[PDB]
DNA sequence: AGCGGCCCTTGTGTTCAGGAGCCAGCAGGGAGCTGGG
DNA sequence: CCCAGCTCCCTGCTGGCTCCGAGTGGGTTCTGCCGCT
């Protein structure tokens, strides 16, 4: 699929957001490197959520299409709504 | 209401009641009775609410 | 006994003209909307006597895009049409070099006759219709949306746009009254445009089977 | 169930209809008009056994059973005619007489017959109190029953327009511990009668003695039975 | 409290209750236990026979 | 009651209120109107529960793919756009068209 | 017209079936088992009343007056004896939509007069 | 033209419709957020209302694609909304009814 | 069971689903198997008032349906043939029907011999009830009417067990 | 007016397409003057409601008339000779078994039926094998005398008699027992037009509600609206109109069932169900 | 002491959830074909 | 140069198979016995 013309939606779905916060929380729970600053937060959830609001999550979402193709949308390229 | 139904019963008992289009005489009698009683319930219900 | 028969014949003829006009065949506007009086003056009002006879109601139209691509419409006299009658029409179509025809029966059609309409499919694309179901144009119904027969070029663009195969689109039985009305066969795609209270207009595409 | 005295009594007075809880038909589960006085219209589970599992009423008494031999002897001694001795021509105007479902014979004057049989049951005579005697009038059948399982309940007999339970009875019932005057002596006096569901159809009850008094407009004026207390319909 | 007893209705019970210094309709003035302030709506209060069911939470 | 009495009290007219107290006949009749409610509430659970299952198993895999179209497990197309508009039923709400009437 | 009753043979007491004498052109009732024959006198062999115009007064019986569950009234006296009291009930017979009609009976003994208003 | 499109879509006089966004409430919210005075003249050029609505209708993309097949679906998907939008955000209504700035 | 065939040969035929027989049997065949061959005697047991032609016209189809049989022996042979145990010889066929109509059919009326008259009189009343129901002269019976039900208590209950077990003993 | 199935039973029959619903009915709309007046509407109602000879017959009777000249009945001797004075049929091919049927003026006038129409239907369903005559529409009793032209005759007469009273359709369409005509008080059934001024106007026109379902025949009738006439039997809709019609008809029935109790469900859900049940060309029942 | 069978009383026997929708099997009847006179 | 069997196919009826809400907490009873080798 041509990444220059991606027909999928530019907004991150509630499900894409859920799995992103979840998967990123596990990494932080496994003592993974943090991308943004932290004041006093010790929970991987609060850390992952702030990373999304900051748009500094190093994850790529592979949106599969019915025909079989796929589109790799990075967490930084998607527009967060909620 | 109980007096009206007694009149409706007297009418049907004296063959003075005709069936309505699309309903049997018995169905007509029950419909009239159900209407009289349903109206009394609504009238009594309004009087109480007031 | 008689005034009703001529009324049925006229309504059937009007529906046929609307049908042939929807398929893309050249039909004049005058005959498209023909009053009962005009029909009686052109054919008669005494089918019981033989004026008009169902053999005179035979219609012959030509496609707008291709003049030689004609279409027949026969009105057999026997209520139950047999295989012998189909051979007569198939023979007549061979003489005039026509490949399409419509058989509007009165009561029904024998099983052996229906099979004859299937074996001669590649040579003669002839269909069967009951006059009882032709007295009304189903497309004029409120429940029946606007159907449109798509072309191979339009279909290819459709499959290429949504990136799907033919077996993925919804299906419609070839024996559907609308499919028979528009004269569509297996493989063809029909575009339906129906009103939607959520979006106003909804365009779907159904594959014939 | 030994969780409370009420459950024990209810369980010992419980009924069951073998229609199957799986059944989804509401006709057998509905509260039929014939559950009056014999069953509690309120006491019933609210789960998947509504209307099937019932509970007897307070004054409900299920018959124990009795042999029809003595009744058949009294009928034969009576003017009743056997089934094999009669001719079919006499069945037109004559009234049939059944016993536990067995067609025994026919009769000509059934009015005085029931009046006699009723008098015998009210005196604790050959016919016991548990015997049911239904005289269908439109249909000339007269069905007598002595089988068991016939749910019945007591009721106060009623004369032309008055009760048979006079004040002299209530006096004796107050001194029940001294003069050993109990319910049995009350039934034998012809004041009370055990009525079954099948006989209630031919019985005209009075909810209370107040209905027996003279009113501006006579409703029935021909009562033949009366209820001891309407609250007895409850379990 | 026999179900069908015309000699006992809601009116007779109310009149008998007004003789003992209580509201004939059972209502009674209550005081908020946290602040002692009266309750604007005269509450209904009286003895009622309640039952405890074997369906406990510990089980 | 007498035979052939289609009157209100004989056919189940509860002319009394729950405060004034119901009569024996009116009480028995009231139990029928109630018992009919219990029976229905106890019977519809199976039929309605069976329906909730039937509807799901037929529409358990139908989902909105990434191309905004509605497809089932077989990849077949049921709707080119959800609800013919591609909109969710949460944010929508009733309105009034001014150019209609 | 009225219905037609079954005719039984005099030899085997079996039902007689209808038959026509082609020679004499007359209706005959013969037995399908024996060789008995009878000259019909009604000329009608079948009658079906679809409207069911049945007079229930013949189905009612005077013994019904002994029913205490039936209502009594003094406004409709008996025409055969003059008795005032009389029981009234509905038809309650199927195939009759106009079943609300009242049928009266005299409570006097040995009279059993029936009528309708 | 849209007026007739609704007549053929809604043959009955039922204007009650379900749509994503309530324009009457958002306009009301704007009146209170910017302190709009319904008695003073408005400074809203009607051409900005028309140009703004046309540009907005293009930003609502239920279907992504410039081909004639996709543009027809997008025009048919947002049809009912674009109609209710042009009828509520009309230049006249915004001048004598809402009087937004 | 004593049923009436739904309308749609000529009229409505009356049959009888006797026990130990898997095929419906016209009521007249049963009446003849009990020793009543004359249709007059049969109707005398069913119809008690010959002045009611409405009932006589309703039973005529059953009569015309079974008229080839006019003796007790042939009727018994027919009944035995309709059952699931058709004896190759007509002798035991009649015996199988004889003991069935004498033991299984209406045992409450009598299981001994010479009681064929009582069974017919009851079977006649059984048909009389069916005609009255079809002619509207009587109301159908309600399955929920407890006057038509019985309560099996410990008495009639424990007796069934003791009886079955005493036999095993 | 009529009993209609609603609630779970109606919701059930839809999800599991049933070929024998409990309360199938039509929604007949009239086109012209019949839509405004009641006299013409009744004529259409009678043209749809199935009417057999049993509905208009009062009592039948089979007689043995050896010579029609001197009939057994005395009140039918006036018009029988007025018809027999001239040979209209093969008198030699006559049977002495007569079938005298008596009708009722009430049921006959309520349907605008005459012995003439009845005679043609009899002479058509049985040809000339069954000769039929009748008196004028002036006598106090409607009577038509039938004979068999040439099982026995008397037995054959009772056979066709009990049969003709059931399968001989005098007027109407079979499978439609009864029809109810009424003026709709709700605007969902009225005729919503657009006046010349542009305003919506709800005309109160007569509509008929049937107990059966026969679209192919009802739709093909004069004075019947071929555009709005629909039904609740989704099966007949698919066999007559197609898959897209039953799709909308199915959605309308579900909406009516869910909205009857004042509730409301988003249309996008009803569409998904109706589409899943029609995305394969056939009515994919949920079973 | 261990291996085999089988108690449902009628060896022949009552309903072991009974009733509402698809589907396979077969009797029935009409179309059409075809080798005889 | 018709025609009655013969074949093929479609209607209609009968009979057989599957389905019959989600959960939860207690209780009792039983998981062989007798004839034969
Ligand atoms: Zn004889
Ligand atoms: Zn008198």
From Swiss-Prot, chain B:
Q: How is it modified after translation?
A: The tandem heptapeptide repeats in the C-terminal domain (CTD) can be highly phosphorylated. The phosphorylation activates Pol II. Phosphorylation occurs mainly at residues 'Ser-2' and 'Ser-5' of the heptapeptide repeat and is mediated, at least, by CDK7 and CDK9. POLR2A associated with DNA is specifically phosphorylated at 'Ser-5' of the CTD by CDK7, promoting transcription initiation by triggering dissociation from DNA. Phosphorylated at 'Ser-2', Ser-5' and 'Ser-7' of the CTD by CDK9 (P-TEFb complex), promoting transcription elongation.
In terms of superkingdom, the source organism counts as Eukaryota
| Localization in the cell | Nucleus; Cytoplasm; Chromosome
According to the UniProt entry, where is the signal peptide?
none
Q: What does this protein do?
A: Catalytic core component of RNA polymerase II (Pol II), a DNA-dependent RNA polymerase which synthesizes mRNA precursors and many functional non-coding RNAs using the four ribonucleoside triphosphates as substrates. Pol II-mediated transcription cycle proceeds through transcription initiation, transcription elongation and transcription termination stages.
The domain-related comment in the record is: The C-terminal domain (CTD) serves as a platform for assembly of factors that regulate transcription initiation, elongation, termination and mRNA processing.
Similarity comment: family membership: Belongs to the RNA polymerase beta' chain family.
**Name used for this protein in its record:** DNA-directed RNA polymerase II subunit RPB1
As recorded in Swiss-Prot or TrEMBL, the protein's gene is named POLR2A
* Section covered of the full-length record: 709 to 758 of 1970
UniProtKB/Swiss-Prot annotation, chain G:
GO MF terms listed in the record are: DNA-directed RNA polymerase activity; nucleic acid binding; zinc ion binding
Indicate the principal place this protein occupies in or around the cell.
nucleus
Q: Binding of Zn(2+) 1: at which residues?
A: 9, 12, 31, 34
One GO CC term, this protein: nucleolus
Location within or outside the cell: Nucleus, Nucleolus
Which residue stretches are annotated zinc finger (TFIIS-type)?
A: 74-116
SUPFAM superfamilies with a match to the protein in the record:
Zinc beta-ribbon (SSF57783)
Q: What is a biological process (GO) this protein takes part in?
A: transcription initiation at RNA polymerase II promoter
Q: Which Pfam families match?
A: Zn_ribbon_RPB9 (PF02150), Zn_ribbon_TFIIS (PF01096)
User: What protein family does this chain belong to?
Assistant: Belongs to the archaeal RpoM/eukaryotic RPA12/RPB9/RPC11 RNA polymerase family.
Q: What does this protein do?
A: DNA-dependent RNA polymerase catalyzes the transcription of DNA into RNA using the four ribonucleoside triphosphates as substrates. Component of RNA polymerase II which synthesizes mRNA precursors and many functional non-coding RNAs. Pol II is the central component of the basal RNA polymerase II transcription machinery. It is composed of mobile elements that move relative to each other. RPB9 is part of the upper jaw surrounding the central large cleft and thought to grab the incoming DNA template.
Q: What is this protein called?
A: DNA-directed RNA polymerase II subunit RPB9
Q: Which organism is it from?
A: Sus scrofa (Pig)
From Swiss-Prot, chain J:
Modifications the protein undergoes after translation, according to the UniProt entry: The tandem heptapeptide repeats in the C-terminal domain (CTD) can be highly phosphorylated. The phosphorylation activates Pol II. Phosphorylation occurs mainly at residues 'Ser-2' and 'Ser-5' of the heptapeptide repeat and is mediated, at least, by CDK7 and CDK9. POLR2A associated with DNA is specifically phosphorylated at 'Ser-5' of the CTD by CDK7, promoting transcription initiation by triggering dissociation from DNA. Phosphorylated at 'Ser-2', Ser-5' and 'Ser-7' of the CTD by CDK9 (P-TEFb complex), promoting transcription elongation.
Write out the annotated subcellular location.
Nucleus; Cytoplasm; Chromosome
Q: What is known of its domains?
A: The C-terminal domain (CTD) serves as a platform for assembly of factors that regulate transcription initiation, elongation, termination and mRNA processing.
Family as reported in the entry's similarity comment: Belongs to the RNA polymerase beta' chain family.
State the function annotated in the UniProt record: Catalytic core component of RNA polymerase II (Pol II), a DNA-dependent RNA polymerase which synthesizes mRNA precursors and many functional non-coding RNAs using the four ribonucleoside triphosphates as substrates. Pol II-mediated transcription cycle proceeds through transcription initiation, transcription elongation and transcription termination stages.
Official protein name in the record: DNA-directed RNA polymerase II subunit RPB1
**Originating organism:** Cricetulus griseus
Q: Please state which portion of the whole protein this structure contains, as first and last residue out of the total length.
A: 1114 to 1415 of 1970
């Amino acid at each position: 699929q041509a990444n220059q013309k991606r027909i999928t939606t530019p907004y991150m779905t509630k499900y894409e957001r859920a799995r992103v916060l979840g998967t990123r929380a596990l990494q932080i729970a496994m003592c993974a490197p943090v991308m943004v600053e932290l004041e006093g937060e010790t929970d991987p959830l609060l850390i992952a959520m702030k990373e999304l609001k900051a748009r500094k999550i190093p994850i790529i979402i592979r949106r599969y299409l019915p025909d079989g193709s796929y589109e790799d949308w990075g967490v930084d390229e998607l527009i967060i709504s909620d | 209401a109980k007096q009206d139904v007694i009149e409706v019963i007297e009418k049907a008992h004296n063959n003075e009641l005709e069936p309505t289009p699309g309903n049997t005489l018995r169905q007509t009698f029950e419909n009239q009775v159900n209407r009289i009683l349903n109206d009394a319930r609504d009238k009594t219900g309004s009087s109480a609410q007031k | 006994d008689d005034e009703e028969e001529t009324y049925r014949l006229w309504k059937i003829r009007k529906t046929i003209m609307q049908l042939c006009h929807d398929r893309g065949y050249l039909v004049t506007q005058d005959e498209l909307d023909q009053t009962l009086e005009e029909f009686k003056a052109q054919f008669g009002d005494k089918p019981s006597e033989g004026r008009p006879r169902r053999t005179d109601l035979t219609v012959l139209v030509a496609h707008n895009d291709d003049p030689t691509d004609q279409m027949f419409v026969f009105f057999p006299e026997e209520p139950k049409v047999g295989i012998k009658t189909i051979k007569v029409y198939c023979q007549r179509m061979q003489e005039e070099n026509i490949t399409r025809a419509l058989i509007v029966v009165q009561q029904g059609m024998t099983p052996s006759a229906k099979q004859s309409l299937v074996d001669m499919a590649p040579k003669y694309i002839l269909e069967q219709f009951l006059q009882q179901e032709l007295l009304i144009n189903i497309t004029e119904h409120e429940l029946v949306p606007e159907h449109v027969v798509m072309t191979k070029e339009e279909v290819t663009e459709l499959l290429a746009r949504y990136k799907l195969r033919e077996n993925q689109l919804p299906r419609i039985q070839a024996g559907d009254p609308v499919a028979r009305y528009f004269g569509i066969k297996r493989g063809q795609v029909v575009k339906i445009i129906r009103p939607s209270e959520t979006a106003g207009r909804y365009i779907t595409y159904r594959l014939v089977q | 169930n030994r969780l409370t005295f009420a459950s024990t009594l209810s369980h010992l007075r419980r009924l069951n209809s073998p229609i199957g809880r799986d059944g989804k038909l509401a006709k057998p589960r509905q509260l039929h008009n014939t559950l009056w006085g014999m069953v509690c219209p309120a006491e019933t589970p609210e789960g998947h056994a509504v209307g099937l599992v019932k509970n007897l009423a307070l004054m409900a008494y299920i018959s124990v059973g009795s042999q029809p031999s003595p009744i058949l002897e009294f009928l034969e001694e009576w003017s009743m005619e056997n089934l094999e001795e009669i001719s079919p021509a006499a069945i037109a105007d004559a009234t049939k007489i059944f016993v536990n479902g067995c067609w025994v014979g026919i009769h000509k004057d059934p009015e005085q017959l029931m009046n006699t049989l009723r008098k015998l049951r009210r005196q604790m005579d050959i016919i016991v109190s548990e015997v049911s005697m239904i005289r269908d009038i439109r249909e000339r059948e007269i069905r007598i029953y002595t089988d068991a399982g016939r749910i019945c309940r007591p009721l106060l007999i009623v004369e032309k327009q008055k009760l048979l339970l006079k004040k002299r009875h209530i006096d004796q019932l107050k001194e029940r511990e001294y003069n050993n005057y109990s319910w049995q002596d009350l039934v034998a006096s012809g004041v009370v009668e055990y009525i079954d569901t099948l006989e209630e159809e031919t019985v005209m009850l009075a909810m209370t003695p107040d209905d027996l008094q003279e009113k501006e407009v006579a409703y029935c004026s021909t009562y033949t039975h009366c209820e001891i207390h309407p609250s007895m319909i409850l379990g | 409290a026999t179900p069908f007893n015309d000699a006992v209705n809601v009116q007779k019970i109310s009149n008998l209750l007004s003789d003992y210094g209580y509201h004939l309709r059972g209502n009674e003035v209550l005081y908020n236990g946290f602040t002692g302030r009266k309750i604007t709506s005269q509450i209904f209060i009286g003895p009622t026979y309640y039952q405890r069911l074997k369906h406990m939470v510990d089980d | 009651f007498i035979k052939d009495d289609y009157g209100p009290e004989s056919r189940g007219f509860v002319e009394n209120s729950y405060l004034a107290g119901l009569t024996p006949t009116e009480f028995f009749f009231h139990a029928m109107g109630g018992r009919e409610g219990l029976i229905d509430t106890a019977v519809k659970t199976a039929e309605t529960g069976y329906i909730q299952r039937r509807l799901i198993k037929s529409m358990e895999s139908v989902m909105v793919k990434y191309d905004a179209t509605v497809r089932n497990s077989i990849n077949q197309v049921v709707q080119l756009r959800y609800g013919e508009d591609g909109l969710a039923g949460e944010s929508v709400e009733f309105q009034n068209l001014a150019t209609l009437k | 017209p009225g219905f037609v009753g079954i005719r039984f043979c005099q030899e085997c007491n079996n039902m007689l079936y209808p038959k026509e004498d082609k020679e004499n052109r007359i209706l005959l009732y013969a037995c399908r088992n024996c060789d008995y024959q009878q000259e019909a006198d009604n000329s009608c062999i079948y009658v079906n009343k679809i409207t069911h115009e049945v007079d229930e007064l013949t189905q009612i019986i005077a013994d019904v007056s002994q029913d205490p569950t039936l209502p009594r009234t003094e406004d409709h006296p008996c025409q055969k004896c003059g008795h005032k009291e009389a029981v009234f009930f509905q038809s309650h017979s199927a195939r009759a939509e106009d079943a609300m009609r009242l049928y009266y009976v005299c409570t006097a003994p040995h009279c059993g007069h029936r009528w309708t208003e | 033209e849209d007026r007739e499109v609704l007549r053929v879509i809604f043959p009955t006089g039922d204007s009650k419709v379900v749509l994503p966004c309530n324009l009457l409430r958002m306009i009301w919210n704007a009146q209170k957020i910017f302190h709009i005075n319904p008695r003073l003249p408005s400074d809203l050029h009607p051409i900005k209302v028309v140009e703004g609505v046309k540009e907005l209708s293009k930003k609502l993309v239920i279907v992504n694609g410039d081909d004639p097949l996709s543009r027809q679906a997008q025009e048919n998907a947002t049809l009912l909304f674009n109609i209710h939008l042009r009828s509520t955000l009309c230049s006249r209504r915004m001048a004598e009814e809402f009087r937004l700035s | 069971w004593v049923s009436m065939l739904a309308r749609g040969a000529i009229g409505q035929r009356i049959v009888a689903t006797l026990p130990y027989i898997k095929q419906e049997v016209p009521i007249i065949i049963v009446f003849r198997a009990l020793g009543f061959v004359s249709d007059r005697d049969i109707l005398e047991h069913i119809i008690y008032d010959f002045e009611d032609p409405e009932m006589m016209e309703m039973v005529k189809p059953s009569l015309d349906e079974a008229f080839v049989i006019q003796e007790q022996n042939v009727a018994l042979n027919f009944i035995g043939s309709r059952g699931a145990k058709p004896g190759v010889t007509k002798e035991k066929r009649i015996k199988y029907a004889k003991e069935v109509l004498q033991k299984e059919m209406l045992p409450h009326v009598g299981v001994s011999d010479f009681c064929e008259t009582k069974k017919a009189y009851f079977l006649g009343y059984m048909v009389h009830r069916l005609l009255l129901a079809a002619l509207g002269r009587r109301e159908l019976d309600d399955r929920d009417h407890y006057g038509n039900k019985r309560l099996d208590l410990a008495g009639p209950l424990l007796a069934f067990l003791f009886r079955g077990m005493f036999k095993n003993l | 007016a009529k009993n209609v199935t609603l609630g779970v039973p109606r919701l059930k029959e839809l999800i599991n397409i049933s070929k024998k619903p409990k309360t199938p009915s039509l929604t007949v709309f009239l086109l012209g003057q019949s839509a405004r007046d009641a006299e013409r509407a009744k004529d259409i109602l009678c043209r749809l409601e199935h009417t057999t000879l049993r509905k208009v017959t009062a009592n039948t009777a089979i007689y043995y008339d050896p010579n029609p000249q001197s009939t057994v009945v005395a009140e039918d001797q006036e018009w029988v000779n007025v018809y027999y004075e001239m040979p209209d049929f093969d008198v030699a091919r006559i049977s002495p078994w007569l079938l005298r049927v008596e009708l009722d003026r009430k049921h006959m006038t309520d349907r605008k039926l005459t012995m003439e129409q009845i005679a043609e239907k009899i002479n058509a369903g049985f040809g000339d094998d069954l000769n039929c005559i009748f008196n004028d529409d002036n006598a106090e009793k409607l009577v038509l005398r039938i004979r068999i032209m040439n099982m026995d005759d008397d037995v054959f007469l009772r056979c066709i008699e009990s049969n003709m009273l059931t399968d001989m359709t005098l007027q109407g369409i079979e499978q439609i027992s009864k029809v109810y005509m009424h003026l709709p008080q709700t605007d969902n059934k009225k005729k919503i037009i657009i006046t010349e001024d542009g305003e919506f106007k709800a005309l109160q026109e007569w509509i008929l509600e049937t107990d059966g379902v026969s679209l192919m025949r009802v739709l093909s009738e004069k004075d019947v609206d071929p555009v709005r006439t629909t039904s609740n039997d989704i099966v007949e809709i698919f066999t007559v109109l197609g898959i897209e019609a039953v799709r909308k008809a199915l959605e309308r029935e579900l909406y009516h069932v869910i909205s009857f109790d004042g509730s409301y469900v988003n249309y996008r859900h009803l569409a998904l169900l109706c589409d899943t049940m029609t995305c394969r060309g056939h009515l994919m029942a949920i079973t």
